Design a protein around this ligand. Structure first.
Ligand SMILES: *[C@@H]1O[C@H](CO)[C@@H](O[C@@H]2O[C@H](CO)[C@@H](O[C@@H]3O[C@H](CO[C@H]4O[C@H](CO)[C@@H](O)[C@H](O[C@H]5O[C@H](CO)[C@@H](O)[C@H](O)[C@@H]5O)[C@@H]4O)[C@@H](O)[C@H](O[C@H]4O[C@H](CO)[C@@H](O)[C@H](O)[C@@H]4O[C@H]4O[C@H](CO)[C@@H](O)[C@H](O)[C@@H]4O[C@H]4O[C@H](CO)[C@@H](O)[C@H](O)[C@@H]4O)[C@@H]3O)[C@H](O)[C@H]2NC(C)=O)[C@H](O)[C@H]1NC(C)=O
Ligand SMILES: *[C@@H]1O[C@H](CO)[C@@H](O[C@@H]2O[C@H](CO)[C@@H](O[C@@H]3O[C@H](CO[C@H]4O[C@H](CO)[C@@H](O)[C@H](O)[C@@H]4O)[C@@H](O)[C@H](O[C@H]4O[C@H](CO)[C@@H](O)[C@H](O)[C@@H]4O[C@H]4O[C@H](CO)[C@@H](O)[C@H](O)[C@@H]4O)[C@@H]3O)[C@H](O)[C@H]2NC(C)=O)[C@H](O)[C@H]1NC(C)=O
Ligand SMILES: *[C@@H]1O[C@H](CO)[C@@H](O[C@@H]2O[C@H](CO)[C@@H](O[C@@H]3O[C@H](CO)[C@@H](O)[C@H](O[C@H]4O[C@H](CO)[C@@H](O)[C@H](O)[C@@H]4O)[C@@H]3O)[C@H](O)[C@H]2NC(C)=O)[C@H](O)[C@H]1NC(C)=O
Ligand SMILES: *[C@@H]1O[C@H](CO)[C@@H](O[C@@H]2O[C@H](CO)[C@@H](O[C@@H]3O[C@H](CO)[C@@H](O)[C@H](O[C@H]4O[C@H](CO)[C@@H](O)[C@H](O)[C@@H]4O)[C@@H]3O)[C@H](O)[C@H]2NC(C)=O)[C@H](O)[C@H]1NC(C)=O
Ligand SMILES: *[C@@H]1O[C@H](CO)[C@@H](O[C@@H]2O[C@H](CO)[C@@H](O[C@@H]3O[C@H](CO)[C@@H](O)[C@H](O)[C@@H]3O)[C@H](O)[C@H]2NC(C)=O)[C@H](O)[C@H]1NC(C)=O
Ligand SMILES: *[C@@H]1O[C@H](CO)[C@@H](O[C@@H]2O[C@H](CO)[C@@H](O[C@@H]3O[C@H](CO)[C@@H](O)[C@H](O)[C@@H]3O)[C@H](O)[C@H]2NC(C)=O)[C@H](O)[C@H]1NC(C)=O
Ligand SMILES: *[C@@H]1O[C@H](CO)[C@@H](O[C@@H]2O[C@H](CO)[C@@H](O)[C@H](O)[C@H]2NC(C)=O)[C@H](O)[C@H]1NC(C)=O
Ligand SMILES: *[C@@H]1O[C@H](CO)[C@@H](O[C@@H]2O[C@H](CO)[C@@H](O)[C@H](O)[C@H]2NC(C)=O)[C@H](O)[C@H]1NC(C)=O
Ligand SMILES: *[C@@H]1O[C@H](CO)[C@@H](O[C@@H]2O[C@H](CO)[C@@H](O)[C@H](O)[C@H]2NC(C)=O)[C@H](O)[C@H]1NC(C)=O
Ligand SMILES: *[C@@H]1O[C@H](CO)[C@@H](O[C@@H]2O[C@H](CO)[C@@H](O)[C@H](O)[C@H]2NC(C)=O)[C@H](O)[C@H]1NC(C)=O
Ligand SMILES: *[C@@H]1O[C@H](CO)[C@@H](O[C@@H]2O[C@H](CO)[C@@H](O)[C@H](O)[C@H]2NC(C)=O)[C@H](O)[C@H]1NC(C)=O
Ligand SMILES: *[C@@H]1O[C@H](CO)[C@@H](O[C@@H]2O[C@H](CO)[C@@H](O)[C@H](O)[C@H]2NC(C)=O)[C@H](O)[C@H]1NC(C)=O
Ligand SMILES: *[C@@H]1O[C@H](CO)[C@@H](O[C@@H]2O[C@H](CO)[C@@H](O)[C@H](O)[C@H]2NC(C)=O)[C@H](O)[C@H]1NC(C)=O
Ligand SMILES: *[C@@H]1O[C@H](CO)[C@@H](O[C@@H]2O[C@H](CO)[C@@H](O)[C@H](O)[C@H]2NC(C)=O)[C@H](O)[C@H]1NC(C)=O
Ligand SMILES: *[C@@H]1O[C@H](CO)[C@@H](O)[C@H](O)[C@H]1NC(C)=O
Ligand SMILES: *[C@@H]1O[C@H](CO)[C@@H](O)[C@H](O)[C@H]1NC(C)=O
Ligand SMILES: *[C@@H]1O[C@H](CO)[C@@H](O)[C@H](O)[C@H]1NC(C)=O
Ligand SMILES: *[C@@H]1O[C@H](CO)[C@@H](O)[C@H](O)[C@H]1NC(C)=O
Ligand SMILES: *[C@@H]1O[C@H](CO)[C@@H](O)[C@H](O)[C@H]1NC(C)=O
Lengths: 339, 194, 339, 404
């Protein structure tokens, strides 16, 4: 199951977007100063309110993090999920073996939302990229808070918390006994020989391997095997849909600069090469009005997107509180059977 | 409060903007032009102001829908923490719930949860069952009890709080064949345990 | 007065004294720029046009009206344009009496009803045919001609009549360069005002080398150039704007640091780090230990240095399990109240 | 090599000139594995054996379209064309994925030109637009001559003289002559179309106003032919030409519909010399009242010269118009030639275009005499007749890439 917890912060410059680099619009925008301070404040406030709430969740533990190792899970091959320790760098923990198989699908097709380098947009010597082509119009994408490292410290702090029994200081019970405490909550086990765990070990590893092969895009051979593809396909479609809806807003905001309004042309330098200064301001005003009317319609959409994501983080906090740490018994909750 | 003020401070401020006309004052037009020439000027103001009002209404309705979304969680918390003492983890408070108190606030409620936090804890020599004569095995029925040993004295307590008492017969079941890590005891001295 | 680098922010935002936070800044400069022109191949052919005005004075009053004014184009009353390039001047003769008695009279053109200006026909304006004249022709706009005595009282003397039609055949030129067989111009490496295949703007033009066959004009989806190509070779060129917006941090009524994208020193600040997607310019120390403002993934401290953000520590014990070992059961308790 | 008529586009009982990607030589190999460099292949199979052909680049990629053909001969020709992305034979995005039942004894084939994948199938000609398909250079062949599998490999742009007699391709001969014919001569298809994969050498777009530069845009242009007269060799003693290909000297190429046309596209042969490209003569029109005489010279007092330059030049020329109304000889000025005169277009309703730009306009034109005195016949490549149709053009650097 997939959920969403964040979005991409946008900060727009005013005078670069409206009148790009011309020092005659800087006189004419003085009568609209109160009309464009409120645009930048409305973005720089929400970009901070997201940051506080995202950094409020991501905690860290140390004694649970050291038990996240593959030697402490018995007969259950769980090696494709645990985080990789050393990347020969100054990093405590890198990404896992499954996250890269996710990022290989959709991140390279993003091209305008992830890890944009602004250091090379000001050198020339190349036709500009799509991401640098928007920086010439004021649109800047800030970095996020959750990088590769904190999502590898928060996740490993929860996977490692399974084997942490209630012993003294830091001892770890075997994982074959940590499922005995989670089956007695269902019904009292009256068998002195653990016969079920052989079949559970034989089934869980194949269940992991079929899912790992499902994300490898080899799809038509594994689709007619079982119904594991039916759960993965919806999640892949949702992950693709998020990236497409993030791209199509900027691709529509940038495209409204070609439309001249009822004027001569859509280029501001082209007007001042032709008309006198007393006659040109009436032309330039018709462009300024339409571009401010476009920016307000952009802001009124970004705020609703932030409100939907605030609505969606709470369900993720509830599921972390109730299925990872608690073993709930609500039917139709985590999974369609017995959790 | 800031988001409630900034909408009206933006709706009122769009009357200064004349559209493609002479001035933003309607009385100033009829003092200057003839009546047959002024209606084309006044129409350009009327169109823009109606276009502003529609954009105001389409925001007010979304605000009402968000508040309808937010009242239900308040009704659930009133139903489950004030009157009920729920046991869902990660619900009211981050610990063990006891009660809750409500007061009002500007446009909303203000909850006051009350939880427990541990300070000390004890070390306890647990066991997992009693095997009489290598055949008959007894274990605890309920999975929230611990049989332990205070140096020759066996007692039973909970797993959440430390409340000791003596074991009785109504807590044991019979689960034949005796896993190894039990307490070896014959039937004659069983009364020293129970 | 606005001379110092903090006072210019107050001049830009139209405000006395500024609240703490992050502000945007982009200080344009007014200057005179050279001009480039690249167009499709055609030969060169030129014509010249004067517009004279000769007057005498002294009828019955001076200040009321001049005595007699003559107007002529090249000695004729009408001149049509039959060539591919032209240029117009305006000449007022003050040497009529030898001693310039015209030192007090100010004769000049106004702006009539034509949809262009008289002093901007010498820029690169494109037409189809013109045929100037000084007598009345049906279907023609006009530029009036005005006379005055030390700008006290005004009068109208004559006019200039002009027809046209739209096209792309006849082009104005600033000044008649002689000897060149095909008119073009190109100025590299600092900011110009280009007119390249009927795209008008500003920027810096550099040269590069890429092997791209195809078009001769590369645009974005907002109507700006990114690079063009010379016809009779295969070299391309790169066009970038020469004013990049920034992010400025303001604290205690002074400037602390900046988030630039240009590898140089900036407004009053000296030292220079290098972060993974921008350059950071400050001048503080490196021993600061506590933060006053925030950004995405760090905190700007009290004098300029950067402090990375650490995650919250949290300890937890798991679910106790059925085992023969030593356990840890809580005994004493306390309360706390949450809001 | 004996193909059909629909695979070449020729008429019955004639002898045309066909250019394009055409097969030359057959192979007979048993090496079982070979990596060629090619742009297409024809083959004939009758033998009961797996015969699979595949186009690819020199390295594996996960975003590249690969062409894969597999024959499995039973009672007829079971052919499986699959233009699909692959996963190291896991097809997951197929532009085409079909299955054809083809007549036994007829050769098939694929050619690639630009981003267009043609498909010859002995009875139709189907066309697909595969993105980024120009990179498919190599060719992997699994064919055995011992099981009666033969195949040819197409390199480039062959000029072929074709003779037909009653639906049967009789002769088939490759020019070791025919220099430069691959860029200026073709054969007219059914219903007056222009064939695919023809690089438009001197085919400009016509206009009354500005000139387009780049981008895809619908138009309304004269691109439906009714004749084509290759290597005309016009002289000083030819005469007039009356806007229809039913005369005594017109030798059309390919199909030939009798109708009435609108324009006459000329095409100029010029060399890199700037001394042999200075031809002496006039152009005589024929209106309803009086004849109009066109010429050019290099001095503004143009009473001493009569030339028309071809190709590149070095100094500007001035172009005039004579007329005669009751011994009153009238002259005027029209304009400057562009630096490289390449094409001259004359319409019926008066107009006159040079490189696609209107200079003047008569009333009504019936015949054109292009009177140029020359010591050879090598001045023109082709003379085409056309009518206005509705097209869709991919313009690139003021030229034409595709046509739909
Ligand atoms: C309608 O008209 C269109 C206009 O003409 C037409 O589009 C144009 O199509 C041509 C293809 O013929 C493109 O030509 C370029 O050719 C470069 C040269 O390499 C090839 O060309 C030679 C002659 O054909 C071959 O001989 C040559 O082989 C040699 O080189 C090989 C490799 O070294 C070697 O193995 C051989 O042995 C031999 O030595 C080779 O075949 C080529 O370099 C160039 O690269 C493009 O493709 C690469 C891979 O995709 C990219 O890495 C590269 O950056 C170029 O891709 C860009 O353009 C794509 C399509 O536009 C985009 O999808 C890409 O994302 C990328 O776009 C980025 O860059 C753009 C600027 O380049 C920028 O504007 C974008 O915003 C984006 O950032 C390419 O093949 C020509 O480029 C096409 N025109 C345009 C504008 O793209 C079109 O085909 C016509 N329509 C139809 C239906 O036909
Ligand atoms: C630059 O700008 C100029 C602007 O003038 C433009 O020139 C004009 O071009 C158009 C396009 O050809 C000329 O319009 C007419 O085009 C039709 C095409 O026929 C179409 O329609 C008919 C009927 O709908 C169909 O049968 C046919 O299949 C096509 O669909 C021609 O047929 C016209 O020719 C007429 O005159 C001939 C001589 O009189 C007749 O023999 C012929 O049958 C046509 O007569 C018919 O129309 C007459 C109109 O009054 C009518 O009176 C008759 O009884 C009969 O019905 C004609 O060519 C248009 O005339 C051009 N303008 C001028 C002033 O001549 C250029 O095209 C433009 N440049 C570019 C590159 O676009
Ligand atoms: C738990 O599961 C994981 C994944 O399911 C598993 O890790 C896998 O281990 C195997 C080997 O034990 C790896 O397979 C090798 O990978 C290397 C990488 O380059 C290849 O070169 C190897 O190919 C050689 O060996 C093959 C078989 O001998 C030959 O056929 C071949 O020609 C080569 O000589 C080989 O494929 C595999 O890559 C990992 N998987 C990942 C994701 O890293 C782990 O072993 C399991 N643990 C337990 C205890 O079951
Ligand atoms: C379009 O115009 C071009 C104009 O150059 C024209 O090209 C020439 O065509 C002739 C045949 O029509 C080519 O052949 C020549 O014919 C004479 C006849 O005797 C030979 O003497 C020539 O030999 C000389 O040139 C050779 C090549 O340089 C030398 O190797 C040799 O020693 C002689 O000096 C020659 O065979 C002629 O070569 C071309 N010109 C060029 C530059 O290639 C073309 O034919 C016209 N197109 C059409 C369709 O008419
Ligand atoms: C309660 O008493 C019984 C029997 O008196 C104990 O069962 C036996 O315990 C031993 C060791 O605790 C088990 O291990 C065996 O050790 C010998 C070495 O002496 C070795 O040779 C054997 O291979 C084996 O490893 C023995 O298996 C076990 N008997 C059975 C039948 O399982 C029991 O341990 C006592 N309870 C406690 C809590 O000690
Ligand atoms: C951004 O600009 C700064 C300039 O302030 C660059 O820093 C300088 O980089 C050079 C080479 O990377 C360093 O080495 C020096 O090179 C010169 C010329 O080769 C040589 O004469 C010196 O002896 C020295 O070797 C130089 O030390 C360094 N400057 C400082 C003060 O450390 C920086 O490289 C630029 N960044 C990028 C990404 O280009
Ligand atoms: C699990 O524990 C083993 C200890 O045996 C770790 O293996 C060491 O990893 C470090 C990482 O740089 C290496 O320098 C050592 O050489 C390794 N020792 C051995 C014996 O392999 C392993 O990294 C731990 N796994 C995780 C995920 O932390
Ligand atoms: C304006 O034009 C008129 C017309 O030519 C000029 O009048 C002539 O002036 C000269 C100089 O004295 C006389 O010789 C002529 O006889 C005048 N012509 C007529 C018809 O009277 C007049 O001088 C011009 N204005 C100026 C200021 O030079
Ligand atoms: C003022 O008077 C002086 C001399 O009286 C004038 O100077 C000369 O005037 C004559 C006749 O007007 C001109 O022909 C000469 O060209 C004048 N001299 C010079 C050097 O120009 C002077 O022009 C008078 N000022 C006026 C008329 O405004
Ligand atoms: C780095 O800062 C710390 C405190 O922020 C400095 O520690 C104290 O600094 C004060 C004044 O600088 C001294 O009087 C104390 O003796 C310092 N205490 C210790 C334990 O060092 C520290 O000196 C600073 N380091 C540098 C190199 O400036
Ligand atoms: C959380 O706990 C750790 C250790 O239990 C504290 O110790 C170190 O603090 C420095 C100061 O920034 C860090 O650079 C080290 O990485 C910390 N050690 C470890 C193992 O993480 C730390 O100060 C505590 N607090 C926070 C906010 O992280
Ligand atoms: C469980 O706890 C008991 C005491 O509560 C431990 O017994 C002690 O073990 C240590 C070993 O470090 C000895 O030094 C002490 O003398 C022992 N004390 C007593 C009273 O027995 C016992 O080791 C713990 N662990 C297990 C597995 O039983
Ligand atoms: C082709 O067009 C011409 C002109 O419209 C038609 O007229 C005759 O053409 C022949 C030679 O092509 C000339 O010798 C005659 O003088 C032309 N007659 C007239 C009255 O101009 C000719 O009929 C058309 N061809 C067909 C087959 O209809
Ligand atoms: C086409 O051009 C040729 C050559 O320029 C013309 O033939 C000449 O015609 C004049 C007319 O009197 C004669 O004096 C010359 O002797 C002719 N020269 C030759 C070589 O024959 C011919 O008249 C032109 N045709 C048209 C219709 O203008
Ligand atoms: C036009 O001016 C010229 C001098 O440039 C002169 O020779 C000619 O006579 C004038 N023609 C008319 C009609 O005024
Ligand atoms: C900038 O352009 C001017 C043109 O006036 C030129 O003189 C100068 O050399 C150019 N370069 C610099 C670095 O100023
Ligand atoms: C050509 O491209 C290379 C690529 O690094 C670059 O270094 C060089 O400056 C370019 N120009 C020339 C003239 O070599
Ligand atoms: C195709 O071209 C290669 C070299 O490009 C050549 O060796 C081969 O003979 C050509 N094919 C035929 C059938 O001539
Ligand atoms: C093509 O073949 C025919 C048949 O003999 C011949 O008459 C004709 O001249 C040939 N064409 C060329 C260009 O040789």
């Amino acid at each position: 199951e997939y959920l969403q917890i964040t979005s991409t912060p946008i900060v727009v410059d005013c005078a670069t977007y409206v009148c790009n680099g011309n020092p005659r619009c800087k006189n004419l925008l003085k009568q609209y100063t109160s009309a464009c301070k409120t645009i930048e404040d409305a973005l720089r406030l929400s970009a901070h309110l997201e940051t506080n709430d995202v950094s409020s969740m991501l905690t860290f533990d140390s004694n649970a993090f050291s038990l996240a190792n593959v030697t402490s899970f018995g007969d259950y091959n769980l090696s494709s999920v645990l985080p990789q320790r050393n990347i020969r760098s100054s990093r405590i923990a890198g990404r896992s073996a499954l996250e890269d198989l996710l990022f290989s699908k959709v991140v390279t097709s993003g091209l305008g939302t992830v890890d944009v380098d602004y250091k090379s947009c000001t050198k020339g010597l190349s036709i500009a990229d799509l991401a640098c082509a928007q920086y010439y119009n004021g649109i800047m994408v800030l970095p996020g808070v959750a990088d590769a490292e904190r999502m590898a410290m928060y996740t490993g702090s929860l996977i490692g918390g399974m084997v942490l029994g209630g012993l003294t200081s830091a001892a770890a019970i075997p994982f074959s006994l940590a499922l005995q405490a989670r089956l007695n909550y269902v019904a009292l086990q009256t068998d002195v020989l653990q016969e079920n765990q052989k079949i559970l070990a034989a089934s869980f590893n194949k269940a992991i391997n079929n899912i790992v092969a499902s994300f490898s895009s080899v799809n038509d051979a594994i689709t007619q095997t079982a119904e594991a593809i039916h759960t993965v396909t919806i999640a892949l479609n949702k992950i693709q849909d998020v990236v497409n809806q993030q791209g199509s807003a900027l691709n529509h905001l940038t495209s409204q600069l070609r439309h001249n309004f009822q004027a001569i042309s859509n280029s501001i330098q082209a007007i001042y090469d032709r008309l006198d200064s007393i006659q040109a301001d009436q032309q330039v005003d018709r462009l300024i009005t339409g571009r401010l009317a476009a920016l307000n319609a952009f802001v009124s959409q970004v705020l609703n997107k932030y409100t939907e994501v605030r609505g969606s983080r709470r369900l993720a906090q509830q599921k972390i509180n109730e299925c990872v740490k608690s073993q709930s018994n609500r039917y139709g909750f985590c999974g369609n059977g017995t959790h | 409060v800031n988001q409630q003020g900034s909408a009206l401070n933006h709706l009122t401020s769009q009357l200064r903007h004349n559209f493609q006309a002479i001035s933003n004052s309607i009385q100033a037009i009829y003092d200057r032009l003839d009546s047959i020439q002024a209606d084309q000027q006044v129409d350009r103001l009327i169109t823009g102001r109606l276009a502003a009002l529609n954009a105001f209404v389409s925001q007010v309705l979304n605000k009402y829908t968000e508040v309808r979304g937010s009242r239900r969680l308040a009704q659930q918390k009133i139903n489950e923490c004030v009157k009920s003492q729920s046991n869902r983890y990660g619900f009211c408070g981050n610990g063990t719930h006891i009660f809750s108190i409500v007061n009002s606030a500007p446009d909303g409620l203000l909850f006051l949860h009350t939880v427990l936090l541990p300070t000390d804890y004890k070390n306890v020599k647990a066991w997992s069952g009693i095997c009489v004569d290598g055949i008959y095995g007894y274990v605890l029925r309920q999975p929230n009890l611990v049989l332990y040993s205070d140096n020759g004295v066996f007692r039973v307590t909970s797993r959440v709080m430390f409340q000791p008492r003596l074991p009785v017969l109504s807590d044991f079941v019979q689960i034949y064949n005796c896993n190894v890590t039990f307490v070896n005891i014959s039937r004659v001295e069983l009364h020293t345990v129970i | 007065y606005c001379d110092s680098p903090f006072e210019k922010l107050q001049c830009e935002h139209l405000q006395f004294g500024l609240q703490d936070g992050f502000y945007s800044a982009n200080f344009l400069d007014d200057n005179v720029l050279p001009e480039t022109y690249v167009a499709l191949p055609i030969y060169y052919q030129h014509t010249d046009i004067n517009f004279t005005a000769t007057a005498s004075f002294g009828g019955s009053c001076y200040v009321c009206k001049p005595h007699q004014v003559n107007i002529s184009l090249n000695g004729n009353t009408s001149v049509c344009v039959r060539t591919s390039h032209f240029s117009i001047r305006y000449i007022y003769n003050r040497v009529k009496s030898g001693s310039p008695g015209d030192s007090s009279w100010h004769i000049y053109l106004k702006s009539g009803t034509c949809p262009f200006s008289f002093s901007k026909l010498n820029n690169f304006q494109k037409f189809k045919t013109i045929c100037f004249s000084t007598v009345e022709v049906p279907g023609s706009c006009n530029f009036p001609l005005e006379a005055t005595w030390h700008y006290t009282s005004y009068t109208i003397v004559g006019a200039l009549y002009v027809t046209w039609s739209e096209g792309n055949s006849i082009t104005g030129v600033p000044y008649p360069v002689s000897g060149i067989r095909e008119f073009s111009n190109l100025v590299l490496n600092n900011c110009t005002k280009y007119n390249i295949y009927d795209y008008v703007g500003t920027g810096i033009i550099r040269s590069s080398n890429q092997s791209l066959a195809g078009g001769i004009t590369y645009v974005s989806n907002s109507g700006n150039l990114l690079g063009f190509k010379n016809v009779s070779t295969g070299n391309i060129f790169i066009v970038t704007p020469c004013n990049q917006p920034d992010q400025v941090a303001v604290y205690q009524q002074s400037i602390i640091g900046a988030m630039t994208a240009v590898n140089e020193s900036r407004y009053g600040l000296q030292n220079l780090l290098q972060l993974p997607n921008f350059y950071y310019v400050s001048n503080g120390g490196n021993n600061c230990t506590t933060a006053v403002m925030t950004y995405s993934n760090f905190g700007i401290c009290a004098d300029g240095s950067l402090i990375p953000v650490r995650p919250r520590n949290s300890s937890d014990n798991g679910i106790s399990a059925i085992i023969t070992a030593n356990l840890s059961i809580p005994s004493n308790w306390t309360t706390s109240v949450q809001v | 090599a004996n193909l059909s008529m629909l695979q070449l586009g020729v008429p019955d009982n004639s002898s045309t000139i066909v250019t394009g990607l055409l097969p030359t030589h057959w192979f007979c190999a048993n090496q079982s594995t070979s990596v060629y460099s090619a742009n297409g292949f024809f083959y004939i199979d009758v033998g009961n054996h797996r015969s699979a052909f595949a186009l690819h680049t020199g390295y594996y990629d996960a975003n590249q379209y690969y062409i894969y053909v597999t024959n499995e001969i039973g009672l007829n020709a079971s052919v499986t064309l699959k233009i699909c992305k692959f996963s190291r034979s896991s097809s997951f995005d197929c532009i085409v994925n079909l299955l054809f039942t083809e007549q036994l004894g007829a050769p098939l084939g694929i050619t690639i030109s630009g981003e267009t994948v043609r498909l010859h199938l002995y009875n139709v000609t189907r066309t697909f637009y595969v993105p980024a398909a120009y990179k498919l250079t190599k060719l992997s062949v699994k064919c055995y001559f011992n099981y009666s599998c033969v195949f040819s490999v197409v390199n480039a742009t062959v000029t072929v003289n074709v003779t037909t007699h009653n639906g049967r391709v009789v002769n088939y001969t490759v020019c070791d002559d025919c220099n430069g014919y691959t860029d200026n001569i073709f054969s007219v298809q059914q219903d007056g179309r222009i064939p695919n994969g023809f690089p438009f050498n001197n085919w400009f777009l016509l206009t009354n106003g500005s000139t387009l530069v780049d981008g895809v845009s619908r138009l309304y242009q004269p691109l439906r032919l009714t004749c084509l007269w290759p290597v005309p060799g016009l002289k000083s003693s030819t005469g007039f030409v009356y806007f229809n290909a039913t005369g005594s000297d017109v030798n059309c190429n390919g199909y030939q519909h009798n109708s009435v046309v609108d324009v006459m596209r000329y095409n100029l042969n010029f060399s890199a010399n700037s001394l042999d490209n200075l031809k002496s003569g006039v152009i005589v029109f024929k209106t309803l009242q009086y004849d109009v005489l066109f010429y050019c010279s290099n001095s503004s007092s143009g009473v001493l010269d009569t030339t028309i330059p071809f190709g590149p030049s070095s100094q500007p020329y001035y172009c005039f118009i004579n007329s005669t109304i009751n011994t009153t000889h009238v002259s005027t000025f029209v304009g400057i030639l562009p630096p490289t005169v390449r094409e001259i277009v004359v319409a019926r309703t008066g107009q006159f275009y040079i490189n696609g730009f209107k200079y003047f306009d008569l009333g009504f034109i019936e015949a054109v005499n292009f009177n140029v005195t020359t010591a050879s016949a090598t001045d023109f490549w082709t003379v085409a007749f056309a009518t206005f149709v509705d097209v869709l053009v991919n313009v690139s650097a003021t030229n034409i890439q595709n046509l739909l």
